[PDB]
Every structure is written in C-alpha cells, then in structure tokens.
C-alpha positions as protocol buffer text, in pm:
chain_id: "A"
residue {
  index: 1
  type: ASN
  ca { x: 11677 y: 10789 z: -57 }
}
residue {
  index: 2
  type: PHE
  ca { x: 11814 y: 10722 z: 297 }
}
residue {
  index: 3
  type: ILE
  ca { x: 12195 y: 10707 z: 278 }
}
residue {
  index: 4
  type: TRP
  ca { x: 12236 y: 10475 z: 586 }
}
residue {
  index: 5
  type: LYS
  ca { x: 12006 y: 10255 z: 802 }
}
residue {
  index: 6
  type: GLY
  ca { x: 12138 y: 10119 z: 1138 }
}
residue {
  index: 7
  type: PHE
  ca { x: 12142 y: 10130 z: 1515 }
}
residue {
  index: 8
  type: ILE
  ca { x: 12226 y: 10423 z: 1757 }
}
residue {
  index: 9
  type: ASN
  ca { x: 12301 y: 10269 z: 2099 }
}
residue {
  index: 10
  type: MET
  ca { x: 12380 y: 10459 z: 2430 }
}
residue {
  index: 11
  type: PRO
  ca { x: 12393 y: 10164 z: 2662 }
}
residue {
  index: 12
  type: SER
  ca { x: 12065 y: 10088 z: 2861 }
}
residue {
  index: 13
  type: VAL
  ca { x: 11911 y: 10440 z: 2810 }
}
residue {
  index: 14
  type: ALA
  ca { x: 11871 y: 10492 z: 2431 }
}
residue {
  index: 15
  type: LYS
  ca { x: 11903 y: 10187 z: 2192 }
}
residue {
  index: 16
  type: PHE
  ca { x: 11720 y: 10229 z: 1863 }
}
residue {
  index: 17
  type: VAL
  ca { x: 11737 y: 10183 z: 1472 }
}
residue {
  index: 18
  type: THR
  ca { x: 11743 y: 10508 z: 1252 }
}
residue {
  index: 19
  type: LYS
  ca { x: 11773 y: 10612 z: 886 }
}
residue {
  index: 20
  type: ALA
  ca { x: 12024 y: 10888 z: 795 }
}
residue {
  index: 21
  type: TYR
  ca { x: 11929 y: 11157 z: 534 }
}
residue {
  index: 22
  type: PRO
  ca { x: 12178 y: 11418 z: 395 }
}
residue {
  index: 23
  type: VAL
  ca { x: 12176 y: 11782 z: 531 }
}
residue {
  index: 24
  type: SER
  ca { x: 12524 y: 11931 z: 426 }
}
residue {
  index: 25
  type: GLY
  ca { x: 12680 y: 11657 z: 202 }
}
residue {
  index: 26
  type: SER
  ca { x: 12594 y: 11541 z: -154 }
}
residue {
  index: 27
  type: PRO
  ca { x: 12423 y: 11192 z: -120 }
}
residue {
  index: 28
  type: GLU
  ca { x: 12566 y: 10921 z: -355 }
}
residue {
  index: 29
  type: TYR
  ca { x: 12651 y: 10600 z: -165 }
}
residue {
  index: 30
  type: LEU
  ca { x: 12838 y: 10619 z: 179 }
}
residue {
  index: 31
  type: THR
  ca { x: 12675 y: 10312 z: 364 }
}
residue {
  index: 32
  type: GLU
  ca { x: 13015 y: 10147 z: 308 }
}
residue {
  index: 33
  type: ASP
  ca { x: 13195 y: 10389 z: 553 }
}
residue {
  index: 34
  type: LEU
  ca { x: 12950 y: 10333 z: 845 }
}
residue {
  index: 35
  type: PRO
  ca { x: 12887 y: 10026 z: 1068 }
}
residue {
  index: 36
  type: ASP
  ca { x: 12540 y: 9896 z: 1168 }
}
residue {
  index: 37
  type: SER
  ca { x: 12541 y: 9991 z: 1546 }
}
residue {
  index: 38
  type: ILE
  ca { x: 12679 y: 10329 z: 1665 }
}
residue {
  index: 39
  type: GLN
  ca { x: 12783 y: 10310 z: 2037 }
}
residue {
  index: 40
  type: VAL
  ca { x: 12758 y: 10655 z: 2217 }
}
residue {
  index: 41
  type: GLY
  ca { x: 13100 y: 10682 z: 2398 }
}
residue {
  index: 42
  type: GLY
  ca { x: 13015 y: 11005 z: 2594 }
}
residue {
  index: 43
  type: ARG
  ca { x: 12962 y: 11384 z: 2571 }
}
residue {
  index: 44
  type: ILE
  ca { x: 13128 y: 11711 z: 2435 }
}
residue {
  index: 45
  type: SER
  ca { x: 13070 y: 12078 z: 2522 }
}
residue {
  index: 46
  type: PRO
  ca { x: 12883 y: 12180 z: 2209 }
}
residue {
  index: 47
  type: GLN
  ca { x: 12830 y: 12554 z: 2285 }
}
residue {
  index: 48
  type: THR
  ca { x: 13222 y: 12604 z: 2307 }
}
residue {
  index: 49
  type: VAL
  ca { x: 13363 y: 12297 z: 2118 }
}
residue {
  index: 50
  type: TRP
  ca { x: 13233 y: 12431 z: 1782 }
}
residue {
  index: 51
  type: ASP
  ca { x: 13604 y: 12511 z: 1717 }
}
residue {
  index: 52
  type: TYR
  ca { x: 13711 y: 12161 z: 1581 }
}
residue {
  index: 53
  type: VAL
  ca { x: 13460 y: 12200 z: 1278 }
}
residue {
  index: 54
  type: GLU
  ca { x: 13610 y: 12558 z: 1235 }
}
residue {
  index: 55
  type: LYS
  ca { x: 13966 y: 12410 z: 1247 }
}
residue {
  index: 56
  type: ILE
  ca { x: 13855 y: 12165 z: 976 }
}
residue {
  index: 57
  type: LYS
  ca { x: 13731 y: 12438 z: 723 }
}
residue {
  index: 58
  type: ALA
  ca { x: 14025 y: 12559 z: 496 }
}
residue {
  index: 59
  type: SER
  ca { x: 13838 y: 12643 z: 170 }
}
residue {
  index: 60
  type: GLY
  ca { x: 13525 y: 12837 z: 50 }
}
residue {
  index: 61
  type: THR
  ca { x: 13243 y: 12574 z: -9 }
}
residue {
  index: 62
  type: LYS
  ca { x: 13400 y: 12309 z: 216 }
}
residue {
  index: 63
  type: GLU
  ca { x: 13145 y: 12059 z: 378 }
}
residue {
  index: 64
  type: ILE
  ca { x: 13174 y: 11799 z: 660 }
}
residue {
  index: 65
  type: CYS
  ca { x: 12883 y: 11556 z: 607 }
}
residue {
  index: 66
  type: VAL
  ca { x: 12596 y: 11635 z: 846 }
}
residue {
  index: 67
  type: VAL
  ca { x: 12295 y: 11391 z: 844 }
}
residue {
  index: 68
  type: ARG
  ca { x: 11962 y: 11395 z: 1030 }
}
residue {
  index: 69
  type: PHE
  ca { x: 11823 y: 11071 z: 1201 }
}
residue {
  index: 70
  type: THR
  ca { x: 11460 y: 10952 z: 1167 }
}
residue {
  index: 71
  type: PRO
  ca { x: 11340 y: 10648 z: 1374 }
}
residue {
  index: 72
  type: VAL
  ca { x: 11177 y: 10380 z: 1154 }
}
residue {
  index: 73
  type: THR
  ca { x: 10931 y: 10242 z: 1418 }
}
residue {
  index: 74
  type: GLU
  ca { x: 10708 y: 10392 z: 1693 }
}
residue {
  index: 75
  type: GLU
  ca { x: 10935 y: 10174 z: 1935 }
}
residue {
  index: 76
  type: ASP
  ca { x: 11258 y: 10344 z: 1806 }
}
residue {
  index: 77
  type: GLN
  ca { x: 11104 y: 10690 z: 1838 }
}
residue {
  index: 78
  type: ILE
  ca { x: 11075 y: 10650 z: 2223 }
}
residue {
  index: 79
  type: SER
  ca { x: 11456 y: 10563 z: 2269 }
}
residue {
  index: 80
  type: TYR
  ca { x: 11523 y: 10833 z: 2005 }
}
residue {
  index: 81
  type: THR
  ca { x: 11337 y: 11095 z: 2224 }
}
residue {
  index: 82
  type: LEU
  ca { x: 11523 y: 10965 z: 2540 }
}
residue {
  index: 83
  type: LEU
  ca { x: 11868 y: 11012 z: 2380 }
}
residue {
  index: 84
  type: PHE
  ca { x: 11761 y: 11366 z: 2260 }
}
residue {
  index: 85
  type: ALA
  ca { x: 11606 y: 11444 z: 2607 }
}
residue {
  index: 86
  type: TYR
  ca { x: 11931 y: 11312 z: 2766 }
}
residue {
  index: 87
  type: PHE
  ca { x: 12163 y: 11563 z: 2583 }
}
residue {
  index: 88
  type: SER
  ca { x: 11924 y: 11856 z: 2529 }
}
residue {
  index: 89
  type: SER
  ca { x: 11866 y: 11872 z: 2914 }
}
residue {
  index: 90
  type: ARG
  ca { x: 12237 y: 11865 z: 2987 }
}
residue {
  index: 91
  type: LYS
  ca { x: 12323 y: 12098 z: 2693 }
}
residue {
  index: 92
  type: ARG
  ca { x: 12587 y: 11854 z: 2561 }
}
residue {
  index: 93
  type: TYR
  ca { x: 12647 y: 11658 z: 2225 }
}
residue {
  index: 94
  type: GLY
  ca { x: 12687 y: 11276 z: 2189 }
}
residue {
  index: 95
  type: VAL
  ca { x: 13020 y: 11120 z: 2076 }
}
residue {
  index: 96
  type: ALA
  ca { x: 13057 y: 10777 z: 1895 }
}
residue {
  index: 97
  type: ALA
  ca { x: 13325 y: 10540 z: 2046 }
}
residue {
  index: 98
  type: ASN
  ca { x: 13337 y: 10276 z: 1751 }
}
residue {
  index: 99
  type: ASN
  ca { x: 13640 y: 10206 z: 1528 }
}
residue {
  index: 100
  type: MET
  ca { x: 13596 y: 10501 z: 1281 }
}
residue {
  index: 101
  type: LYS
  ca { x: 13706 y: 10370 z: 938 }
}
residue {
  index: 102
  type: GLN
  ca { x: 13782 y: 10707 z: 754 }
}
residue {
  index: 103
  type: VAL
  ca { x: 13574 y: 10905 z: 1011 }
}
residue {
  index: 104
  type: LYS
  ca { x: 13808 y: 11055 z: 1282 }
}
residue {
  index: 105
  type: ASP
  ca { x: 13525 y: 11174 z: 1510 }
}
residue {
  index: 106
  type: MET
  ca { x: 13137 y: 11161 z: 1486 }
}
residue {
  index: 107
  type: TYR
  ca { x: 12891 y: 11360 z: 1698 }
}
residue {
  index: 108
  type: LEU
  ca { x: 12514 y: 11345 z: 1765 }
}
residue {
  index: 109
  type: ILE
  ca { x: 12363 y: 11693 z: 1789 }
}
residue {
  index: 110
  type: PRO
  ca { x: 12024 y: 11734 z: 1969 }
}
residue {
  index: 111
  type: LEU
  ca { x: 11862 y: 12009 z: 1757 }
}
residue {
  index: 112
  type: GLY
  ca { x: 11526 y: 12130 z: 1917 }
}
residue {
  index: 113
  type: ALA
  ca { x: 11388 y: 12481 z: 1846 }
}
residue {
  index: 114
  type: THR
  ca { x: 11692 y: 12714 z: 1793 }
}
residue {
  index: 115
  type: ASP
  ca { x: 11624 y: 13091 z: 1716 }
}
residue {
  index: 116
  type: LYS
  ca { x: 11978 y: 13122 z: 1564 }
}
residue {
  index: 117
  type: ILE
  ca { x: 12063 y: 12786 z: 1384 }
}
residue {
  index: 118
  type: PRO
  ca { x: 12406 y: 12655 z: 1526 }
}
residue {
  index: 119
  type: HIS
  ca { x: 12616 y: 12891 z: 1311 }
}
residue {
  index: 120
  type: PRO
  ca { x: 12924 y: 12678 z: 1227 }
}
residue {
  index: 121
  type: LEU
  ca { x: 12717 y: 12411 z: 1039 }
}
residue {
  index: 122
  type: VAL
  ca { x: 12459 y: 12638 z: 859 }
}
residue {
  index: 123
  type: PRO
  ca { x: 12632 y: 12672 z: 513 }
}
residue {
  index: 124
  type: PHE
  ca { x: 12503 y: 12333 z: 384 }
}
residue {
  index: 125
  type: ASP
  ca { x: 12565 y: 12344 z: -1 }
}
residue {
  index: 126
  type: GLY
  ca { x: 12338 y: 12067 z: -144 }
}
residue {
  index: 127
  type: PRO
  ca { x: 12026 y: 11966 z: 55 }
}
residue {
  index: 128
  type: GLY
  ca { x: 11915 y: 12120 z: 390 }
}
residue {
  index: 129
  type: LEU
  ca { x: 11674 y: 12107 z: 683 }
}
residue {
  index: 130
  type: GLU
  ca { x: 11311 y: 12228 z: 672 }
}
residue {
  index: 131
  type: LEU
  ca { x: 11186 y: 12528 z: 888 }
}
residue {
  index: 132
  type: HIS
  ca { x: 10899 y: 12315 z: 1034 }
}
residue {
  index: 133
  type: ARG
  ca { x: 11095 y: 12037 z: 1211 }
}
residue {
  index: 134
  type: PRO
  ca { x: 11041 y: 11817 z: 1515 }
}
residue {
  index: 135
  type: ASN
  ca { x: 11314 y: 11763 z: 1780 }
}
residue {
  index: 136
  type: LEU
  ca { x: 11602 y: 11619 z: 1571 }
}
residue {
  index: 137
  type: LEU
  ca { x: 11927 y: 11417 z: 1639 }
}
residue {
  index: 138
  type: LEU
  ca { x: 12187 y: 11496 z: 1372 }
}
residue {
  index: 139
  type: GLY
  ca { x: 12496 y: 11293 z: 1280 }
}
residue {
  index: 140
  type: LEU
  ca { x: 12817 y: 11512 z: 1233 }
}
residue {
  index: 141
  type: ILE
  ca { x: 13061 y: 11338 z: 981 }
}
residue {
  index: 142
  type: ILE
  ca { x: 13288 y: 11416 z: 668 }
}
residue {
  index: 143
  type: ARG
  ca { x: 13196 y: 11461 z: 297 }
}
residue {
  index: 144
  type: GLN
  ca { x: 13377 y: 11643 z: 4 }
}
residue {
  index: 145
  type: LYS
  ca { x: 13265 y: 11694 z: -369 }
}
residue {
  index: 146
  type: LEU
  ca { x: 12893 y: 11717 z: -464 }
}
residue {
  index: 147
  type: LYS
  ca { x: 12742 y: 11542 z: -772 }
}
residue {
  index: 148
  type: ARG
  ca { x: 12888 y: 11185 z: -767 }
}
residue {
  index: 149
  type: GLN
  ca { x: 12783 y: 10911 z: -1016 }
}
C-alpha cells in the first residue's frame, strides 16, 4: 500500500502529485498527519546538517519516518525530475514550509547514485530501499513503534 498520496509544490519550478511508500517506519495509517499539498519553503545544507537527525536519536532501534516519493503520472515525473535536478545540482535538501501538525520539520532528500548511502538514515528497521533504484526524492519525517493494528 501507499501510505500517502498528495502534491509536492516548489512554486513555478516543480509542482506534481506523488505517492509516499515507507523506507524506515512501520506502515499502518499516517495519511491523517499529512496535508494534500506540500509547499517547499527553501533549502538546507544536507552534507553537514545531518546533525539534527543525530540529535533526535536517543535509543537503540529509534526511527524517524523516511518515505520515498513515486510520481503517479508521466506529467508528474517531469516536475519530479526538475525538483530532483534542482537540489541534486546545488547539493542541498528541500524543506517544507506548511503548518506541521505533529511533524516539527520535514525534508526532501534528492538520492541519486551514492557509493556510501547517507549514513545517518541507513538503519531502517522495517522496510527499506532496493539496490537498483532510479533518481529518488525521499520525505524525511517521524515514526515510532513498528507493527500497528
């Protein structure tokens, strides 16, 4: 199942619809906690500003929910690729500006072909990403627990 379907809008440049699939959180109903359109507020220094995720981790098998985005239409895939191309070229991450209900901060991570997988997210605990991937935009959010029902 897709956990969330909705828009990812960076004004003018990338505006598109995308489905969100779990990568490092247990998937059981979280569409409640997310709006329909995600406005991209700006940027953040990914290569150094790992530290905020590191500051979050207190325990042993602690997850912050990380999802991958797939565009639903051939049309969405162009805008998708533009937003990816936008951040990947500049070596920055996207940041969401929208009223964040229980989410404090949310980030879009352009993941292309990395030899070492961005280290501070790799321990997934639950699902995970495949080795044969396209260029992917990931959503960085919050989960805790695993098997819900």
